[PDB]
RNA sequence: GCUCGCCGGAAGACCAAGGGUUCCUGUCCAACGUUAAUCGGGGCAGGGUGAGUCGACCCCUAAGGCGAGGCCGAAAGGCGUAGUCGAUGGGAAACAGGUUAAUAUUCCUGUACUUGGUGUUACUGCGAAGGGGGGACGGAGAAGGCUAUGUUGGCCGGGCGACGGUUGUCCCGGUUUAAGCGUGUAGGCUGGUUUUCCAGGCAAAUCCGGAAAAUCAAGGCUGAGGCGUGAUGACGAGGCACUACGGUGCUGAAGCAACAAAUGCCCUGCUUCCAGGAAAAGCCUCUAAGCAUCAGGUAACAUCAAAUCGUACCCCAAACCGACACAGGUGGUCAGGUAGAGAAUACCAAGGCGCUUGAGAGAACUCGGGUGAAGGAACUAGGCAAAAUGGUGCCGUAACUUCGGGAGAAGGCACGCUGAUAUGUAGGUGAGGUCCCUCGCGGAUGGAGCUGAAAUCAGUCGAAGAUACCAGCUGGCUGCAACUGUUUAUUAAAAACACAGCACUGUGCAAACACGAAAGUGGACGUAUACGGUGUGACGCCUGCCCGGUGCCGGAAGGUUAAU
RNA sequence: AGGACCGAACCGACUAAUGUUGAAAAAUUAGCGGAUGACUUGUGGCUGGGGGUGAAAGGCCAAUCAAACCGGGAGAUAGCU
């Protein structure tokens, strides 16, 4: 019921939460 | 945390209001664009 | 002296209520729905002329309109004005 | 009198106060005050024009007679006062007709002395008379450049100017910087050195004492990035370049005077 | 409804901002609510916000904005004068009690107050866009006087105890009262008064300021609180009656004193320091043109007016900002008891909650904790984390030092309760009483009563007396940075930045420089003991050689050399 | 007296654990630093993108910064997938 905002821009990933789980060993 | 929207009607209307748009040339072009698009709320001002 | 045509366009209706019946029986005060732009002097002159009754004092307040939903479409009722008109003692009104 | 502070705390370790007990311990003269709103070094565009300025204690402006036009009328010195707007102390004087004014306090001036401007003024420290009436070789301050414009030279706490010559319409001055300058011989000047000579003997001791005076901290240019300053950058401490402004102008030695209007008034430059 | 538990400087109460009807009542349970739901900030309908004194509006201005003309600019437009906006600041006035399902300093009762009007009467220099005064202002600190408020006693009302005892040195509760008006106090500031004169305050001035002379030391301003009145009132424990058990009506006792006491008030004070601490109007006053016996002025009285808008509700939160009924964030006000230095902390009051899934079981494992034999860092990159220390008073305390520190160094002793000193001391408070008086909110004397540490001595209990919560681990060598500070919001708080200081150099004022096609503005209403830039970075001892290169400064004889 | 000391409010964020489709798009718990000053905070105002501001980390400029966001040139170009 007026239930939008589910997968619109997936801000889910616009969060872009910091990656690179301290693995700069692959250098 | 302290988020980026801390409302205040005086600052909202002085910054984005009708008289502030009608004051300058470019602000009058903003109201002409919203009238051409057919906006219901032409500005912030209630 | 406020003209009679405006005095005839000031008053809209009496307001029926438990509070209105209480103020009528205790303080001898009627509760009126008035025009929104009507002032206290226009109300006191209207009640003193159209009802032929002696007005002691008039207190006013503005009633904000409620937001209703007809079906699911939103809407908002009108703001209207309410007057507590205190009659002098001995005076009587329907 | 300079007073070295006892080191009860760092920040009092190196403080030297300049204590003058003759200054008035009260409010200044209210009619001669006006509002002095701070700027932050920002012009009418809001941009910072001159950096490192900001903050500090609130300061009221004291209206100071530099033009010094009350000729003939003697004036007694009422009291000495502190001026936050400037390094020199000011003197509240009372003319005979009932007018009170502020002047710059000279060296030996105290409460109760008599001063007098005008041509028929005497020659004592405090008097103001034209330099065609002032003898060659005397020390004056509050010196006009143009007649009636007001004194502009030698206004800081301990300064003075010697009169070394006169050739008709002009007198030649020895400025405190060492520059020899011609001034018209009708410009007013005030006898004696300016008062608070030990002002430069103070030591602020701590950073807050400059923040009290509205001096924001100065970031040196090599501690920056190259987008910010020409000196910026380096992977350590590197300065392999000539010292410039933030705008790329040589600082160590390069002259910047470009006034061809006043070169006829300059006898010798400083040095 | 009875128990239990939690907060209680909040998880209570009042607001601003913000939201915008979420408020109250009736009704419904589809959806919403992380379950059910008869419930709800949900749906539906109705009701509800009452002001001359609260606030806004309004008068006034700050930063700043706009800006007639104006200056400038290809155009747009930029800056800015006169002006005009702009609060977060200045400016008149109302309190107590009662009442609604929901509003109240708004309604009602009582008692006040303010500013404007018109009209009367008496009196008669009124008058500003101008002059002056005032408004009008900082930090820190020290006490003194108070009050809020609390405690105890007295007083009044009630009680005599589910289990030993309890008519008493016993238990519970209450003991409230305003604005205003009068008095002008502790205390703070101040020399008053009269006349003459005067290059000043754009002109004037009786005003301010300044010169004189004479007289009087004692007048004035401000001022918390108290006292009286307000108030024979109101409120009031309780009773007396009806009772839809919710309530409604009637009646109503005592309503005092002492002590302690604020971070609140006197205090916009006083003292002191340097970093030297808004403006304008309202208000008071002065005269200018003008008005000349008119206008206007103040004094009393009467009368009238005081409009309009907001007012419900949340407001450290389920209603605001976070997508959520989200463990986050959000500014002001109030500040009870016992212990305690305390607004910490523990337990409580008033008041409000138990956080919108529960019920069992009592595996591994994880989370948050408790205890642990012997050993005591052997763990580990590393004593990470834990554990430990922890208070007051006294004794005592090293190297080194910039003589301040180090230092709470380290280390150690005492600490409960009862009694005596002293049926509660020293001290504080201060009555009666008496005397004096220029008489009052007076001054002595006087010590009642109240309050009340701390210490010594004796005794006594426990394993343990800073018994809980709370509450430093310490020391030795050394690198770096002088220090306090600042910084990568969201992996880096550091030796990095800054710093006081030092030096070089520029800059003579229409300053250099910077923002701006420009006008202009900052620097600075400053003037070389100043300002800008650059490097170094307290302090102590110091800072040596090189000008060839690259820069910069100075030179101007010669060579070269542009447009023309 | 003090950019003095201990320490609540307040401001900050040194360490560990949890959590990491979280209660939370950076927080909680236990400790921690400053706490009369170069302090902190409320309201309002000003500075605008090659620009601001910056006790200087290329930090911050609306959860976005070695050059913000929105719209347009624009169906940029892409010997690349
Ligand atoms: Mg009324
Ligand atoms: Mg109203
Ligand atoms: Mg500077
Ligand atoms: Mg420096
Ligand atoms: Mg520096
Ligand atoms: Mg760097
Ligand atoms: Mg460069
Ligand atoms: Mg290197
Ligand atoms: Mg090298
Ligand atoms: Mg219950
Ligand atoms: Mg509890
Ligand atoms: Mg609704
Ligand atoms: Mg409700
Ligand atoms: Mg309901
Ligand atoms: Mg069902
Ligand atoms: Mg459900
Ligand atoms: Mg509802
Ligand atoms: Mg202005
Ligand atoms: Mg303008
Ligand atoms: Mg114009
Ligand atoms: Mg105005
Ligand atoms: Mg305001
Ligand atoms: Mg006002
Ligand atoms: Mg209510
Ligand atoms: Mg004035
Ligand atoms: Mg102050
Ligand atoms: Mg009392
Ligand atoms: Mg018993
Ligand atoms: Mg018994
Ligand atoms: Mg009792
Ligand atoms: Mg009274
Ligand atoms: Mg309310
Ligand atoms: Mg609450
Ligand atoms: Mg919940
Ligand atoms: Mg919450
Ligand atoms: Mg307490
Ligand atoms: Mg607490
Ligand atoms: Mg278990
Ligand atoms: Mg343990
Ligand atoms: Mg063990
Ligand atoms: Mg053991
Ligand atoms: Mg080992
Ligand atoms: Mg090992
Ligand atoms: Mg540890
Ligand atoms: Mg521990
Ligand atoms: Mg004892
Ligand atoms: Mg080493
Ligand atoms: Mg350091
Ligand atoms: Mg530090
Ligand atoms: Mg930070
Ligand atoms: Mg970080
Ligand atoms: Mg960190
Ligand atoms: Mg200038
Ligand atoms: Mg360095
Ligand atoms: Mg050298
Ligand atoms: Mg060379
Ligand atoms: Mg050369
Ligand atoms: Mg040549
Ligand atoms: Mg400190
Ligand atoms: Mg501390
Ligand atoms: Mg914490
Ligand atoms: Mg870098
Ligand atoms: Mg960001
Ligand atoms: Mg850019
Ligand atoms: Mg680019
Ligand atoms: Mg194209
Ligand atoms: Mg494409």
Residue numbers in the entry:
A (entry chain B): 1 to 27
B (entry chain c): 1 to 46
C (entry chain S): 1 to 94
D (entry chain C): 2 to 272
Excerpt from the publication:
As a model protein, we have chosen the cold shock protein A (CspA) from Escherichia coli, which is a major regulator of the transcriptional response during cold adaptation in many bacteria. It consists of 70 amino acids (aa) that form five β‐strands connected by loops. Strands 1–3 form an antiparallel β‐sheet that is closed into a barrel by packing strands 4 and 5 to strands 1 and 3, respectively. Here, we combine biophysical methods with cryo‐EM structure determination to show that folding of a β‐barrel protein begins with formation of a dynamic α‐helix inside the ribosome.
To explore the nature of CspA intermediates inside the exit tunnel, we determined the structure of the ribosome with the 27 aa‐long CspA nascent chain (CspA27) by cryo‐EM. After in‐silico particle sorting, we solved three structures that showed different conformations of the nascent chain and carried the P‐site tRNASer corresponding to the mRNA codon 27. The cryo‐EM densities for the CspA‐27 complexes reveal three different nascent chain conformations inside the tunnel. In conformation 1 (CspA27‐1), the nascent chain is more extended at the N‐terminal part; the region immediately below the constriction site appears more compact. In all three conformations, the CspA nascent chain makes numerous contacts with exit tunnel residues. In all conformations, U2609 and A2062 are in contact distance with the nascent chain. Arg61 of L4 has identical orientation in CspA27‐1 and ‐2, but contacts the nascent chain only in CspA27‐1. Finally, when we extend the PTC comparison to CspA27, most of the PTC nucleotides superimpose between all structures, except A2602, which adopts a rather distinct orientation depending on the nascent chain conformation. However, when examined at lower threshold (contoured at ~1.5σ), nucleotide A2602 cryo‐EM density can be observed distinctly displaced toward the A site in the extended CspA27‐1. This position could potentially alter placement of the incoming aa‐tRNA and suggests a mechanism whereby the nascent polypeptide folding could locally attenuate the elongation rate by modulating aa‐tRNA accommodation.
